[PDB]
Amino acid sequence: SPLRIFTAGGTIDKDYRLEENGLVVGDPFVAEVLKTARLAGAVSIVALSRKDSLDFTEADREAIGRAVGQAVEDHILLTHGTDTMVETARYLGGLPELAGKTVVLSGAMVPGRVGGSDAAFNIGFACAAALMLAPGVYIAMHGKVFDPAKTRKNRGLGRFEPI
Amino acid sequence: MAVSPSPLRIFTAGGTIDKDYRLEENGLVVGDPFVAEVLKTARLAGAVSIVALSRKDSLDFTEADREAIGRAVGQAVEDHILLTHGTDTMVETARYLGGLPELAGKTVVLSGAMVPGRVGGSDAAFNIGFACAAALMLAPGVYIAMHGKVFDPAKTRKNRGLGRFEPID
Amino acid sequence: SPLRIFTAGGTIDKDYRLEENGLVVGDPFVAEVLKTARLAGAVSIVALSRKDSLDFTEADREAIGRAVGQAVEDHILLTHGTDTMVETARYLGGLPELAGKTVVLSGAMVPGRVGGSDAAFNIGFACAAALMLAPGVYIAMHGKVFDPAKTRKNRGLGRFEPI
Amino acid sequence: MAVSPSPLRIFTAGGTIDKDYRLEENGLVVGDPFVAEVLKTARLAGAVSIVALSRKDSLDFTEADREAIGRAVGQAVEDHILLTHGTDTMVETARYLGGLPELAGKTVVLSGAMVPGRVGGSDAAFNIGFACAAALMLAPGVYIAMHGKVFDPAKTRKNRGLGRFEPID
């Protein structure tokens, strides 16, 4: 089935800028991974935001919900920061307009542009999850699927975990 | 305290995915399993046992090699299996495994890479992530996971000139 | 001739840490480059500091000067941040105890662990400079050799330039 | 306003440094010059003109190939030259160039890589930086810059089994 990928920012997309003396959320790394993936099927990417997910407001989550509803596609990947991925995912789970879609959130604990990143694995795993899971909203990280309503980010473990 | 389960086992048979440069050869050999390098930085919740079966270019596989892969997969207790392999005779191995009654309750996915993981611009890491998800989520059967898609081995062939798996119409 | 490499930190050595939500100055990247360089000769690496060079004090520059004087070797590479590389280099140029040494400072505008970094090139170029230049103190960046006394960092160009 | 000079010219002749995977070949070919990829992110003050002479494994070089490299280097106006090349017959090309009176005023450095730049764990970027410095800083003559050292071609041989240039005692 056609997959629509929305990019909202996060650590996955961070890149170094000399002006900042550090990282900024940069161009979406999922486009760099899919460029070499030799894809057979119909996939397209849309930018929604370039924010660290710590910076997301309730107005941002509402805007993300409406944007995902602008896609006719029933299989959606949203790349996002991990720090408020649960808050977005739980918000999207409450939108009756998205009930027929499979919506998977993912991202990376280490930027794709930094050595030793989880990003490319996570993108492959999450694209499969978006194609194969039944309608609902899910987090695909750490090589497994999480139910947002029963998940939290454990900042001491650096992992999502059950509540 | 919650214990993270480990329901996937991976077997490695070689292929372009695992190729690495050797100075003594003036070229590539089939080297150490690249899937182990991808999983090292995947930040997995579980742990994945990785078992080496062979280190061959799949052009070099014989019927006896295919039979030996089938015996190893049938011995596994896990019902979710990823086999990394060369793409050139991946369909032959997948169709062979499909005919084995000892695999009937297992989800067995074959994958690899058209470009070595250790070469720049490789599909390998994406393919591993996709294929791990497919091994978890697909019903029992035998599948090829490549190009961000699932292929039925009976209805698929390798197009070597264009470096892709394609349907038989 | 034997080369002694001192690592003082800088952007070259930055690496991502989940706890920080960003980069820290991490393990010296020159050790990662030399591990695959297939070296023939005698080279050794010593850690001096893990600081962003913005954070260096006059006490730090004095301590760097004494540390370089602890090396018997007459060919020295000091990896360092670019923001106060001129201040360190000018300070070391004034130390009569270092007059017989060839001391080359280098680093990278982009961290070695980030994609698209100048670091490995810069390390190769700077190791040659440390071996081949006459006694003195030099900055080796941008594929050329700078005299510290006649150089400044241009933060608008992202380059060292003559004064 | 100050103008950054460009005193180095680079010539590319191929070698392991430039190898890249090709699916059609099921293996490596000598591809696009890797030195161009290193210089793209080097943040150079100048600009370096890069000129392709050949795309060969140096095992394949003939006397006529060596003569054609000499003519191209002698034509250059620059007196600082880096030639990227295969390591297997780098000494033969370097000793040949050494005997050419048209190069007597030039600093000519040959370099390459034991591992392709496009393979993980390559010496190539380091070697390019080192060799660019050597081409700038060394007196007129012909040199091999490898292993973080400068070699005199008349006193050097390639040890293929151990993947290194070494002195003749």
Ligand SMILES: N[C@@H](CC(=O)O)C(=O)O
């Ligand atoms: N602070 C980042 C962390 C991450 O993405 O891992 C974010 O949530 O955007």
Ligand SMILES: N[C@@H](CC(=O)O)C(=O)O
């Ligand atoms: N000849 C290789 C091709 C590949 O894996 O893409 C193999 O089948 O092992």
Ligand SMILES: N[C@@H](CC(=O)O)C(=O)O
């Ligand atoms: N702020 C960094 C900048 C750099 O190294 O390029 C430092 O001077 O440590």
Ligand SMILES: N[C@@H](CC(=O)O)C(=O)O
């Ligand atoms: N056979 C290769 C070896 C190398 O470059 O290291 C060549 O000489 O082109």
Ligand SMILES: [Cl-]
């Ligand atoms: Cl080897």
Ligand SMILES: [Cl-]
């Ligand atoms: Cl090969």
Ligand SMILES: [Cl-]
């Ligand atoms: Cl795939």
Ligand SMILES: [Cl-]
């Ligand atoms: Cl940062």
Ligand SMILES: [Cl-]
């Ligand atoms: Cl190709």
Ligand SMILES: [Cl-]
């Ligand atoms: Cl070298």
